[PDB]
RNA sequence: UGCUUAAGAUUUGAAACU
RNA sequence: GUUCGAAGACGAUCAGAUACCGUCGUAGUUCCGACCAUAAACGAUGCCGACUGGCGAUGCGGCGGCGUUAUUCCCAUGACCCGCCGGGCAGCUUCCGGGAAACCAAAGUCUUUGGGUUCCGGGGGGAGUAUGGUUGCAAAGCUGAAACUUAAAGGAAUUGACGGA
RNA sequence: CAAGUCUGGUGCCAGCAGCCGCGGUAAUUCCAGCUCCAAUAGCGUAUAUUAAAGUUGCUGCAGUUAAAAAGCUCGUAGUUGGA
């Protein structure tokens, strides 16, 4: 059964970019995954979503534009300081330009360029780009 | 066996395609012909060539052919295309129309028409195939 | 000598109105003709010729040779190509190779790595490539690292004026043949990768089809 | 493509799709440019102007060039709202 | 196609195709055809929708007004139903159509007899026109299909949904659109009727043709 | 690997700590009977005694009779 | 040998190798 | 390799089945393996019939037949040539041989 | 509408762009 | 303890047959009671989890429905017919995608590499052998090396020659 | 893997060769001459060893047919556990 829900999901937004879909639906709503959404959408990767409440486990419908190459999830979970983020972001990504780490920190949810504005590490999340 | 080559079958078209007028039906007729509209070297090669035009020039009096065009038929066909009946075949004055037809014809701009014969559903489902 | 074109295109160059070979690539029109290349790059259009493999095979008398040509060929800034041909003998086989390759040239992409001052001198982005068990990956670079690959590539990058490169290799790489391929479809999918500044939608042109309609009815059929 | 002074390095500029958003190769030789003319709105004649469109490959082989372009022009305003 | 009063699916043309039948479809409805159907009947055919054949049509012939030239504009069919339909609608027009038995390698290879380079493709039928719409995904081309309710959309780029089958809907609907793009450049009134008949464009039998022979005279 | 746990270390390191010992160049190398059984004990070269001079045969295309020294 | 008929000659050696630990036990 | 989907039987969700003897050989064939045969036939051909009918008693008697259920192994089945091999592509037409002679 | 029909010494082949 | 039938005797066939062929035939084949734990035990594809195209079918439970069919006195139960939904063995078709290829809605979502979690392989032979333990009345089974020896052994497709096909 | 189809001898003999391979009466590979190459006061031959090896694989391997998933379920430690 499901131990990450945001592991089957940045595989269920993985599927639909691959045939080319517009909009899909995903079945659990995490807090986590809300401030993953709402972290992609400041770059602009997606268009605005929303979510659907019953009074369980919330769904959320997600409206795709075309910029989004490969959305991902780290399994497991992991420390990295200051020292190893450079050793991440050699091997994990495609350049340096773009492309976005994401690990949460005890102040917060935020990609790795803003966790050198802070002098801030913590456990990762996943990447996208 | 007596089967004629290719390098008949493609002479003896070319020789109708330019002188269907000039050819005719007897055997030594355009047996002489054929010497003085073509280089034909020798002889046997000009009896076989006439031999087989004699054959054509009568399948043609029996029916079209195929991978030869005749300007003559060009016209009857061209006419034939061109038939052209004098009353309509379309502007009746009725129509047999379902009633769920009708229902979307209201669903349409032109919601009554003048001679929709309205007709009865069939009673019955029993439209597919058995199983053997 | 006097090369008659058949085409569209052939007869659309042979009045000097298209002006280069980006209206080619903007449309994807297929090149049919190997004397529009000659006609636009007969100065900077080099050839490396790879290998001449000898394959054969077998009938009831003996055994029958006929020989393989692999050809890469192309300038040091802009385009590349590749041409695999075989016939009986390396002569008839390596001129109809170079006409293959003339007729299966792309365009190169690239970008920088980090700093952004000069020229363009490395690939943009982290590509792959493979055909049949060959697996080629080939990274970005800083400046002055030079060529990191095998002598084969070494060569056809070297076609393309990447100066700076990583390069990766999976499988058997004892097939020149594969490899070639493999390194040639590395390189044939940079335009086909998006990059967030390619983000500004395209105003669409006129077709050149379409741009030149009227001078090509009173000049052919 | 600027590199420190705004300078366009790139040779060109490549295609971009209309449907799914991902762009068109040169080798791409299945993908289509529509041109759609506009009509005067008491007529009903050529009145000179292009609406155009481009569609990839992949999608075209899939099966699904109509829905695009029935989306595209509903929402461009050539067929009426009810369709 | 519409937004407009004028453009509109007039009565004749209605009680006409009321008429031949082009409202019939066929018997399995295919998943990307779902949008035209109003509603299976019994005896299980499937209704289709006027209004979406006309939408469709109207842009069809939109596409094929605004190419410029008129002479690069194909046709092809192959079935005996629609020869003498797309022979007239290439004569009122100036297409240069194709008329059974598709020679293959036509489009892609220089050295045959008519190496056309054309610009749109229309087609009667896919199943039995398969050929071309492979050879229109090597060289760059748009496609128009006479599609039913039936066929599949591969490689197709925009269908008009009708009737197929029958000696009158092909020959109709040829018509319509033939009538369509004479509306739409400025050479035929809008207002007034066509002169000609649509049954121009049917399919004899060769037996009907020979039982006109002896009572006519 | 398979498991991909954060505190699967015991796992990991006693499953490659096993099938170390299926290499080939690590069992005849390191510990196990074949520095044993090196009739030189690990060494580069070693003295003798000729006690005959034979010849051996060669093997397939080949037709000799090579030289070969019992010490 | 085919595999069986190894298998088989295998079991008719081990079952004279145990006895042939004979007047030794 | 494979060489056919199913392994040339009709075994997909059991495990087992029964055997079942041949007829001219004795070979064990599992039931749904073996080439099952249907033969009905008149005790008379063609011509003898109109010599029963005449030298009968009753009017026109009608002749009873003779239902037998068959059974073949594959190396009777073939060798008494009763099918034949066919190339790969033309494995998959699984309708039955028609009807005419 | 089917009977039998064992065997055959060791060695010996390779291609370049102008 | 019917029938078949290892071992065995016998009659032919064959150069020779201790083999296939044919007559007889013990041990066994069947039943209850105690054991042994091995098979191409094969879909030669570990278990839970979803996810991403369709098209017809077939089987249980359920949801409606024109209409025939019997009960006749009809709601309701039975039999066909047209649809929907769950999961269960399957099937055609396809440029999703992959793969060395045959081929697969999974052997897919993999250099754009990470959902969780068990067992196991590291060239071929020597060899599943030696020894050492251990369960078993026996046959045998579970764990299980080396010494030496060799540059090929092997899987998928292509052409040719070949077949008492 | 840079560089002789040079000349004279033996004729599956004697021998070279890390690997493919050479030698049976014209050997570019053998013993010798001539010539030619690479490193240069240094160079080869053994052995131990690291990289190459994503052929020990945490980054980064395989398990249908090539080596490969226990015959099948249950089950205590362990490992991982929804909102
Ligand atoms: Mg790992
Ligand atoms: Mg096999
Ligand atoms: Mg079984
Ligand atoms: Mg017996
Ligand atoms: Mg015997
Ligand atoms: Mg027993
Ligand atoms: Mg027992
Ligand atoms: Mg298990
Ligand atoms: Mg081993
Ligand atoms: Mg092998
Ligand atoms: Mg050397
Ligand atoms: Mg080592
Ligand atoms: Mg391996
Ligand atoms: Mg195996
Ligand atoms: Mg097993
Ligand atoms: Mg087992
Ligand atoms: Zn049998």
Redesign the pocket.
Known sequence: ?????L??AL??I???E??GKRQ?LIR????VIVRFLTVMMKHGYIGEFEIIDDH??GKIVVNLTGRL??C?????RFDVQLKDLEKWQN??L?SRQFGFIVLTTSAGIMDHEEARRKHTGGKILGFFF | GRVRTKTVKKAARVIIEKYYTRLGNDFHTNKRVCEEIAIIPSKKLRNKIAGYVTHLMKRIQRGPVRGISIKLQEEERERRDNYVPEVSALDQEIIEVDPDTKEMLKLLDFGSLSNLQVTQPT????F?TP?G | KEWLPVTKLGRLVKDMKIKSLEEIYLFSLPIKESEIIDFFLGASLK?E?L??M?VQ????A??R?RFKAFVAIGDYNGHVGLGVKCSK???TA?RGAIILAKLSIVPVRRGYWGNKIGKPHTVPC???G?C??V?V?LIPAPRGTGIVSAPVPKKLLMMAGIDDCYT?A?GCTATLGNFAKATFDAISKTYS?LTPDLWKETVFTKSPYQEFTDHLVKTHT | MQNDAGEFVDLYVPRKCSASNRIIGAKDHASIQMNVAEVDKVTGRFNGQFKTYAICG?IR??GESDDSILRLAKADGIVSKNF | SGALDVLQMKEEDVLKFLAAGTHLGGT????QMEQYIYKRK?D?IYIINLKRTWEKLLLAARAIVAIENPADVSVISSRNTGQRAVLKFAAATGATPIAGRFTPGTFTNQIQTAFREPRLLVVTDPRADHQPLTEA?YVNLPTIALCNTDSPL?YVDIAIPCNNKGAHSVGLMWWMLAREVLRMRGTISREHPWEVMPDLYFYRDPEEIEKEEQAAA | ????????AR??RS??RD??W???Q?????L???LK?NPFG????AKGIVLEKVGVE?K????????CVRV | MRAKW?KKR??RL??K?RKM?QRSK | ??KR???GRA???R?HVQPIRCT?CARCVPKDKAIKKFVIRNIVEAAAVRDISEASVFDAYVLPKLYVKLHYCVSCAI?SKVVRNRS?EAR?DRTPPPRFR
């Open positions: 059964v499901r131990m990450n829900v592991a089957d595989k269920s993985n599927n639909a691959k045939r899909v659990p709503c995490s807090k369980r486990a190459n490969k991902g999830v780290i399994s497991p091997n994990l495609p | 009673v019955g489902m029993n597919k199983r | 050839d010729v290998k001449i000898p095979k077998q009938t009831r003996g055994q040779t003998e390396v002569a390596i982290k590509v792959t493979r049949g068990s697996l990956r990766s999976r990768y | 992949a082989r899939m | 399995n409805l295919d998943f019994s299980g995904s591969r | 690997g398979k498991c991909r746990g954060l505190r699967t796992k990991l499953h490659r099938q170390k299926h290499d080939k690590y069992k005849k190398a390191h196990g009977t074949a059984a690990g060494a580069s070269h060669a397939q295309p080949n037709s000799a009779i090579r030289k | 190894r295998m079991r081990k079952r190798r630990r | 390799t494979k989907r199913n392994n075994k997909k969700g495990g001219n060798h790969r998959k």
